[PDB]
Design a protein around this nucleic acid. Structure first.
Length: 1085
RNA sequence: GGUCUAGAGGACAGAAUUCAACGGGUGUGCCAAUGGCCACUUUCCAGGUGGCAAAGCCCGUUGAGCUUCUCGAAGUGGCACCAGAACCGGAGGACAAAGUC
DNA sequence: GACTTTGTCCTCCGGTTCTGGAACCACA
DNA sequence: TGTGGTTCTTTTTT
C-alpha cells in the first residue's frame, strides 16, 4: 500500500575486525537456525521431498520419501518424550504422525490450500512449541493486543465483531493440538536454537521467564516463509500438471476426430526423418516430431503447392519452397520438412486438411511440455554459503533486534548504523554484545535521505529530482548481506558486509489520507496488465473540479488531465506524445496559429483530447552521425575479422575427416574459390592460410589418407596458433586498451545505453564462446563442463549494462510524464527543471502476449530478449508508485499499421540517405535498399535524396491521404503508434471496428460469412449480422445473424476500397499498390 | 536552408565539429568504461583457478599546460538505482553433422 | 548474415509466493 | 519509546 525502496549500504569494517567476524558468525547462525526449523517442518509434513537431479538437469529425484520422513519424525518425537521425562501415555505411532500432521497444517496452512500469515503463525507457535513453560496458543493468557471488538467497544461502536471472535475461535484447533502435544510429553516439541547444543555463541543469559531470544524468532519466521511459498508451489505445480494431462486428452478427440488416418501418417513421417537423420542419435520421446517452428510459413507453401500436379517432379515442388523462403529468410521453417512433405506418399497431410499439420504441431508441443513438466516443486534447505538467507533487523521500535540509522555521526556525509544487539568474536569465542555503532562507506545514494524528527529517529525525508517537495518516509527492516562470490570462499581475510535497509516512502497522495489519487476514479485499470479504460461519465466533472492552472512538475497533478502514451522500441527506447483533456472552446497556438491536433472523446461532445507535445525519449547512444557511424564500424573491425577467420578454420578441419565424401566435399569448397574476395579477414593470417592451402594442393591425390590427414591437422595447428596470438592481442586492447572516455555530460555518444552497445558486448561473448569451444578434430562435439563458468567478468558487465539501461529508461519515461526535462546551461551544466504540467496517466502498449515463443525465429526471440519490454513495463510500475502516476496499457494490435490522424492503413517506410546519392564520394547501398532495388529491378534508375522506400519495417509511417495517387501522409512510425494508442483511449477502441474473424455458412439460403463473437463488444455489434459477397473479396453486412476462416479488414477512413469489408490478403495489397506501386512507377520514369 | 507534421527539446536527411603535489573519499553500476603482473589449467590462444602487488578511481585546493570567449575570465565529470530467498516456466548462446537463400 | 532436425552444457527473460509488522501486559 | 511472551486476523519488434 506504501512505496517500499531498498538502499543497500556498505559497512566500513576495516578498523573493527572483531565485529566483522561477528557479523559473519551471526550469518552462519541464522542460516543454521532457519535450516533447523525448516527441516523440522519437512518432517511434520511427512510427505515426499524432491531435489535437483544431478548427472543431468531436467527431471527430479526423491531426496527423502514419505516413509523416510515418518520414521525420522517418529525417531525425533520418541526421543523428545524421553528428554521431557514423560511418564504418561506415549501415544501410538499413528496418533503421533496424525498429531504432527495436524500441527504442520496449522504452521503452513498452504499445505491444504489455505492462506497463512508468516508473521503471526511464527509468533503464535514458537514459544508453545519450544518453551517448556509456555501458555500461548491456549486461551489462558491475558496479555496480547486487544481484539477488534474491544477496540470498537471503547471507541468506534461491536455486535457482529464479537461474534466473529468466537465463531473463529471455534474453528481454531490450536488449543487442542497444543494440549494433545502436552499429553504426549511433547510440551517442548523443538529446541530454541540459541539455547541448544547447535550454537557455540555465548549468548546473553536468559532473563527470568525467558526461553526464546529475538534471534530465534527471526529464524523461525523465515522458516515459515520459505515453507509457505514452497507448499504454494507444490499445489501450483500439481495443478498445472493436471491441466496438461487434461489438455493432451481434451485435444485429440476435439481437433482430429474424423482425421485419424492422417495421425498415423505423420507418425510414420516423424519416424521416417528419425531414422534417416545424419545428426546425433535421438533420446527424447518427441524427437523429430513435427513442431510449429519447422512449419513456419507453411501457409504460403501449401497454397503454391495446390496449383501443382500430384505426379509432378520434385524440382517444381522444391523450387516453390525456395521462393517462399526468399520472400523473407527470417520467417521460414525447415527445408527438409517441406522436401519430405512434397513426396507423394506424404502429400495427404497437406492436401486433405491444409491446417491439420499445424493442428498436430500443437499436439506435439503439448506432448513435449508434458514429458518435461514437473509434478512437484523441488525442496532445498537454506545454507550459509549455497542458498543463503540474511539476518533481519527490525527498525527502531520493532520486536526483533533493532537498529538505528545515525545521520552524520562522524562527518558531513559520514553516516553510521547502531546495532542494538550484535555478535562479537575475540580469539575464537563468539559473544553477544549490545549497542555496536558501525560507520557507513560514502554513498551518494544516501544523500537522498534527510532526518525528519529528532525525537523519532525512524522518520526521514526522501529526495527526488521529479518532486519539488521531499516525500515523508520511515526506516523499515534491514538485512545483513554479503556478496555471493565472497560467500563460497573462506580464506583468511577480513569480505565486505552490507546492510540492506528498507525505506518506506509516502507519496503526496498518500500524505493527504486518500486511498487513491482523485484522478484514479477517471481511469479504470483492469487486470495484471493494467488495461486502461476511461470513465467518460466522470471526466466532465473532474475538469470542473480540477482546472488547468499551469502548475508544473509534481505540483500540477491535481490540476488538469493529461495522458502520455509511450511507444517502446529498439532504435529509440521510447517515443511519447502528450495529450490534454480540454473543452472544444479553444483557440490557435503561440507558434504560428495552427489549429492544434485533437481527438474526439467518446461521450462528451464538449471535450476533446488536444495534443500538447511529442518527443523521442532517446537514451544516450541512440543517435547517429558520420563520425559515429565510422567509430561503430571500427569498434567491431577486428571482431568481424576473427569471426570470418574461424569459419574458414572449420572448413579446413573438415578436410581432415575420416569420411571420404566429407573431406572431398569440404576440400572442394576451399580450392574452388578465392579465399577472401570480400577482404573480411586480416592480411597476415590470410597469407598464412593461403600458404597451407597451396601446400595441401601439391599433396591432394599425390599422397595417402593417413599421410594427408596428418598434414591437414598440422596445418590447422599453425593457423590456430597464429590466430591464437591475434585473439590474445584483441582482448588485451579490450580490457587495458586506452579508448576515449567521455567527461561530464555529452550527447551523441558511441554506445551509451543503446541496444547496439549491449549487443556489441554480446557479440564479444558469442565469439569467445565459439573460439574456446572450437574443435581441431572434425566431427567432435565440444560443450561446456557440468559446472563451468565462461567470461565471468564480461558477463557481469553485460548484465549490469542491461540493468542500467532498464532503470534509466523507466526514469526517463517518468521524468517526462511528470513534466521535467534535463536541460543544459553550461553555467550549471545539466539540471532537472519542471517545464510542463504533469501527466496523470502513462499509457503503454498492451504487449503481454508478445512473448518469446519457439514458433518465432531465433533472431526474433533474441531481439525480444534484448528489448525485454515486459521488464520495462514492470520497472515503470515500480518507479511510478511514489509519484502517484498511473501506468496502463492499450490494445496494441495494428497500432503501427494504421494512420493515427487519418485512420487509413499504411506501410512502414525508410528514406534514402544522402550518403548514397551524392555524386562526390557516395557510400554503398544498405541491405534494405538492395532488396528493394532487386525486387522491382531498378538498377538503372537514379534514386534521389529522401526518397521513400517501402520496406514494411522502417521508422517512417506512410498512409494514403486521399484517392489522389501519390497523396501521402508521412509521420514517425513510433510516434504514429504512440498517438494511435491515445486515439484508442478517448474512443474506446475495439478490434471489431477494423478486423473480424468469420466462418462460412448458410443463414438465409446463401453462403455468407458468420463473424466469430469474441468479447461482448463483437457480440454487441455483429451478432445479428452477416456478410455476403459477389466477388469474394469485398463483403457487405446483412441483418439475419470452404473450411478455413476468413479475416475481413476495414478502412475506417474510407480511402482503401471505400472502407468496405475486404478480405485480409487483397486489403493489404491495395495498401501496397497505392503506396509501393506508386513509388516504384515514379522511380521508373 | 531541403524533405515530413505533431508545430514539439519537433523528426528524417544534410552541411558544420588532458598531467603531480598535497588533502579527503572510494555504496551498486553504466557512460567508447570488459583492470595489471606471476603461476597453474600438458602444450602456445581463449576461458577458468589461485596468488601477488601497487594502485588505478572520483572529490577539493594550488600550479601548470592545453581550448573557446571579452578589451583577463570561464571550461576540463556526467547519469540511474526496490530489494531478499526459493520455485516454475519461457527462450537464447556455443559446438558437430546434414540441408537450405 | 538468414533458416531447420538430432543432444548437452552454460546463460538470460518472465512470472509467482513468501517477505522487508503492530501492539498489549506483566516484568521487578 | 524498555523486553519477552502473547495476541493481532475474514499484432507487437526490426
Amino acid at each position: 500500500s506504501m512505496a517500499v525502496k531498498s538502499i543497500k549500504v556498505k559497512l566500513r569494517l576495516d578498523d573493527m575486525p572483531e565485529i566483522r567476524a561477528g557479523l559473519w558468525k551471526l550469518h552462519k547462525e541464522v542460516n543454521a537456525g532457519v535450516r533447523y526449523y525448516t527441516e523440522w517442518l519437512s518432517l511434520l509434513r511427512q510427505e515426499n521431498l524432491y531435489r535437483r537431479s544431478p548427472n543431468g538437469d531436467g527431471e527430479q529425484e526423491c531426496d527423502k520419501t514419505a516413509e523416510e520422513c515418518k520414521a525420522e519424525l517418529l525417531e525425533r518425537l520418541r526421543a523428545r518424550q524421553v528428554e521431557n521425562g514423560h511418564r504418561g501415555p506415549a501415544g501410538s505411532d499413528d496418533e503421533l504422525l496424525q498429531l504432527a500432521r495436524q500441527l504442520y497444517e496449522l504452521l503452513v496452512p498452504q499445505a491444504i490450500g489455505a492462506k497463512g500469515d508468516a508473521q503471526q503463525i511464527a509468533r503464535k507457535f514458537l514459544s508453545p512449541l519450544a518453551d517448556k513453560d509456555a501458555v500461548g496458543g491456549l486461551g489462558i493468557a491475558k496479555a496480547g493486543n486487544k481484539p477488534r471488538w474491544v477496540r470498537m467497544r471503547e471507541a468506534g461502536e461491536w455486535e457482529e465483531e464479537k461474534e466473529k471472535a468466537e465463531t473463529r475461535k471455534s474453528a481454531d484447533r490450536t488449543a487442542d493440538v497444543l494440549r494433545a502435544l502436552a499429553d504426549f510429553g511433547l510440551k517442548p516439541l523443538m529446541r530454541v536454537y540459541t539455547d541448544s547444543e547447535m550454537s557455540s555463541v555465548e549468548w546473553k543469559p536468559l532473563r527470568k521467564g525467558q526461553a526464546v531470544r529475538t534471534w530465534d524468532r527471526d529464524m523461525f519466521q523465515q522458516a515459515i516463509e520459505r515453507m509457505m511459498s514452497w507448499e504454494s508451489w507444490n499445489q501450483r505445480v500439481g495443478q498445472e500438471y493436471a491441466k496438461l494431462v487434461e489438455q493432451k486428452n481434451r485435444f485429440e478427440q476435439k481437433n482430429f476426430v474424423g482425421q485419424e488416418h492422417l495421425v498415423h501418417l505423420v507418425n510414420q513421417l516423424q519416424q521416417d526423418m528419425k531414422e534417416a537423420s545424419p545428426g546425433l542419435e535421438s533420446k527424447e520421446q518427441t524427437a523429430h516430431y513435427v513442431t510449429g517452428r519447422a512449419l513456419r510459413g507453411s501457409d504460403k507453401v501449401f497454397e503454391k503447392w495446390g496449383k501443382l500436379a500430384p505426379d509432378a517432379p520434385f524440382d517444381l515442388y522444391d523450387a516453390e519452397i525456395k521462393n517462399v523462403q526468399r520472400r523473407n529468410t527470417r520467417r521460414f521453417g525447415s527445408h527438409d520438412l517441406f522436401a519430405k512433405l512434397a513426396e507423394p506418399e506424404y502429400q495427404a497431410l497437406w492436401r486433405e486438411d491444409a491446417s491439420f499439420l499445424t493442428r498436430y504441431a500443437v499436439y506435439n508441443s503439448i506432448l513435449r511440455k508434458l514429458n518435461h513438466a514437473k509434478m512437484f516443486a523441488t525442496f532445498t534447505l537454506p545454507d550459509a554459503t549455497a542458498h543463503p538467507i540474511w539476518t533481519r533487523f527490525d527498525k527502531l521500535g520493532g520486536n526483533l533486534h533493532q537498529y538505528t540509522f545515525l545521520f552524520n555521526e562522524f562527518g558531513e556525509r559520514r553516516h553510521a548504523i547502531r546495532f542494538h544487539k550484535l555478535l562479537k568474536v575475540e580469539n575464537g569465542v563468539a559473544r553477544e554484545v549490545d549497542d555496536v555503532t558501525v560507520p557507513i562507506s560514502m554513498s551518494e545514494q544516501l544523500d537522498n535521505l534527510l532526518p525528519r524528527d529528532p525525537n523519532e529517529p525512524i522518520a526521514l525525508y526522501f529526495r527526488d529530482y521529479g518532486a519539488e517537495q521531499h516525500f515523508t518516509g520511515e526506516f523499515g527492516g534491514a538485512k545483513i548481506q554479503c556478496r555471493r562470490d565472497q560467500l563460497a570462499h573462506m580464506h583468511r581475510r577480513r569480505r565486505d558486509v552490507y546492510l540492506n535497509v528498507s525505506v518506506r516512502v509516502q507519496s503526496q497522495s498518500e500524505a493527504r489520507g486518500e486511498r487513491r489519487p482523485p484522478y484514479a476514479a477517471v481511469f479504470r485499470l483492469v487486470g495484471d496488465n493494467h488495461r486502461a479504460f476511461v470513465h467518460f461519465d466522470k471526466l466532465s466533472d473532474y475538469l470542473a473540479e480540477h482546472p488547468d492552472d499551469g502548475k508544473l512538475g509534481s505540483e500540477g497533478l491535481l490540476s488538469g488531465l493529461r495522458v502520455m502514451s509511450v511507444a517502446l522500441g529498439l532504435r529509440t527506447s521510447a517515443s511519447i506524445s502528450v495529450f490534454r483533456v480540454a473543452r472544444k472552446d479553444e483557440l490557435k497556438p503561440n507558434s504560428k496559429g495552427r489549429v492544434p491536433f485533437f481527438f474526439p472523446i467518446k461521450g462528451n461532445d464538449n471535450l476533446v483530447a488536444v495534443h500538447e507535445r511529442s518527443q523521442l525519449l532517446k537514451l544516450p547512444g541512440e543517435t547517429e552521425s558520420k563520425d559515429l557511424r565510422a567509430i561503430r564500424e571500427e569498434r567491431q573491425r577486428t571482431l568481424r575479422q576473427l569471426r570470418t577467420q574461424l569459419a574458414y578454420l572449420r572448413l579446413l578441419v573438415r578436410c581432415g575427416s575420416e569420411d571420404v565424401g566429407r573431406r572431398e566435399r569440404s576440400w572442394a569448397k576451399l580450392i574452388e574459390q578465392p579465399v577472401d574476395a570480400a577482404n573480411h579477414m586480416t592480411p597476415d593470417w590470410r597469407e598464412a592460410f593461403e600458404n597451407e592451402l597451396q601446400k595441401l594442393k601439391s599433396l591432394h591425390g599425390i599422397c595417402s589418407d593417413k599421410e594427408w590427414m596428418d598434414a591437414v591437422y598440422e596445418s590447422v595447428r599453425r593457423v590456430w596458433r597464429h590466430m591464437g596470438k591475434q585473439v590474445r592481442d584483441w582482448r588485451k586492447d579490450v580490457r587495458s586498451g586506452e579508448r576515449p572516455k567521455i567527461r561530464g555530460y555529452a550527447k551523441d555518444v558511441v554506445g551509451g545505453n543503446s541496444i547496439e552497445q549491449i549487443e556489441y558486448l554480446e557479440r564479444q561473448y558469442k565469439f569467445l564462446k565459439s573460439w574456446s569451444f572450437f574443435g581441431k578434430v572434425s566431427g567432435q562435439v565440444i560443450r561446456a563442463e557440468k559446472g563451468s563458468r565462461f567470461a565471468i567478468t564480461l558477463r557481469e558487465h553485460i548484465d549490469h549494462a542491461k540493468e542500467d539501461r532498464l532503470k534509466k529508461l523507466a526514469d526517463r519515461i517518468i521524468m517526462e510524464a511528470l513534466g521535467y526535462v534535463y536541460a543544459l546551461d553550461e553555467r550549471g551544466k545539466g539540471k532537472w527543471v519542471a517545464k510542463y504540467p504533469p501527466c496523470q496517466l502513462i499509457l503503454l502498449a498492451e504487449l503481454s502476449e508478445y512473448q518469446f515463443n519457439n514458433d518465432r525465429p531465433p533472431s526474433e526471440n533474441n531481439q525480444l530478449m534484448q528489448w525485454s519490454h515486459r521488464g520495462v513495463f514492470q520497472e515503470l510500475i515500480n518507479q511510478a508508485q511514489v509519484h502517484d502516476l498511473l501506468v496502463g496499457t492499450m490494445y496494441a494490435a495494428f497500432s503501427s499499421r494504421f494512420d493515427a490522424r487519418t485512420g487509413a492503413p499504411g506501410i512502414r517506410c525508410r528514406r534514402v540517405p544522402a550518403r548514397c546519392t551524392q555524386e562526390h564520394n557516395p557510400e554503398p547501398f544498405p541491405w534494405w535498399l538492395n532488396k528493394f532495388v532487386v525486387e522491382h529491378t531498378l538498377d538503372a534508375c537514379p534514386l534521389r535524396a529522401d526518397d521513400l522506400i517501402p520496406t514494411g519495417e522502417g521508422e517512417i509511417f506512410v498512409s494514403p491521404f486521399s484517392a489522389e495517387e501519390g497523396d501521402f501522409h508521412q509521420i514517425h512510425a513510433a510516434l504514429n503508434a504512440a498517438q494511435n494508442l491515445q486515439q484508442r483511449l478517448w474512443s474506446d477502441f475495439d478490434i471489431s471496428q477494423i478486423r473480424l474473424r468469420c466462418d462460412w455458412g448458410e443463414v438465409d439460403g446463401e453462403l455468407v460469412l458468420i463473424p466469430r463473437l469474441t468479447g461482448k463488444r463483437t457480440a454487441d455489434s455483429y451478432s445479428n449480422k452477416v456478410f455476403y459477397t459477389n466477388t469474394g473479396v469485398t463483403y457487405y453486412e446483412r441483418e439475419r445473424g470452404r473450411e478455413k476462416s476468413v479475416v475481413l479488414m476495414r478502412d475506417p477512413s474510407g480511402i482503401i476500397n471505400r472502407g468496405n469489408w475486404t478480405r485480409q490478403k487483397e486489403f493489404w495489397s491495395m495498401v501496397n499498390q497505392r503506396i509501393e506501386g506508386y513509388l516504384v512507377k515514379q522511380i521508373r520514369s
